[PDB]
């Protein structure tokens, strides 16, 4: 408190949090439940990555 | 249809044709260019006016 300081840890964290790579895309082939929970995501990500209408394509860009 | 004729020697057989139609396919393209300054200052976060 006694001094404000010259930088904001909040801003530094939030500005880095936008430069970390996207995680990997796993696919469990040992449990049916996880297998489906990942294939659902696979189809959602294809849609989001190839549908012109949305801006999410341009974001994944 | 067909007309039934008498003087014609053998009565004309009724007619049916098979017609096979094909569907053409046409593909369409456009190109839009976008700058990395936009694609970056978008991922960043605004804090000041």
């Amino acid at each position: 408190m006694k001094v404000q300081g010259s930088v904001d840890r909040r801003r530094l964290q939030r500005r880095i949090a936008g430069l970390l790579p996207p995680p990997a895309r796993r696919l469990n082939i040992s449990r049916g439940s996880e297998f489906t929970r990942d294939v659902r995501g696979l189809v959602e990500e294809h849609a989001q990555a190839s549908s012109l209408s949305a801006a999410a394509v341009w974001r994944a860009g | 249809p067909t007309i039934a004729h008498g003087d014609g020697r053998r009565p004309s057989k009724q007619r049916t044709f098979i017609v096979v139609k094909n569907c053409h396919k046409h593909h369409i393209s456009t190109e839009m260019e976008l700058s990395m300054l936009d694609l970056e200052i978008l991922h960043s976060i605004p804090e000041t006016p």
Side-chain angles (χ1 to χ4, degrees):
Chain A
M1 53 147 295
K2 279 170 181 166
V3 307
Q4 186 175 271
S6 87
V7 300
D8 209 356
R9 306 196 180 194
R10 275 199 212 150
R11 176 184 184 271
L12 215 36
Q13 285 192 300
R14 299 169 76 169
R15 276 307 192 86
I16 292 186
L19 257 44
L20 327 171
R25 210 86 172 89
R26 300 224 161 281
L27 175 66
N28 186 292
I29 57 178
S30 64
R31 272 162 290 275
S33 55
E34 313 182 359
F35 184 76
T36 68
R37 293 170 204 165
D38 302 2
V39 167
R40 288 235 177 89
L42 199 58
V43 315
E44 293 194 19
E45 195 59 283
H46 160 64
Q48 161 172 164
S50 75
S51 291
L52 177 63
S53 326
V57 152
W58 181 91
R59 226 214 112 79
Chain B
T2 59
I3 299 188
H5 272 99
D7 289 345
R9 293 182 183 174
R10 269 195 178 189
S12 175
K13 193 46 182 64
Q14 80 196 353
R15 304 212 308 276
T16 47
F17 314 140
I18 295 184
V19 185
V20 158
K21 280 313 182 67
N22 317 140
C23 79
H24 300 291
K25 269 188 55 57
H26 300 291
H27 322 92
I28 278 181
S29 315
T30 299
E31 289 205 330
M32 293 183 284
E33 197 169 21
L34 268 185
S35 188
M36 199 79 77
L37 313 187
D38 309 321
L39 295 174
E40 183 178 2
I41 72 179
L42 177 63
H43 284 245
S44 69
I45 290 188
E47 196 169 283
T48 299

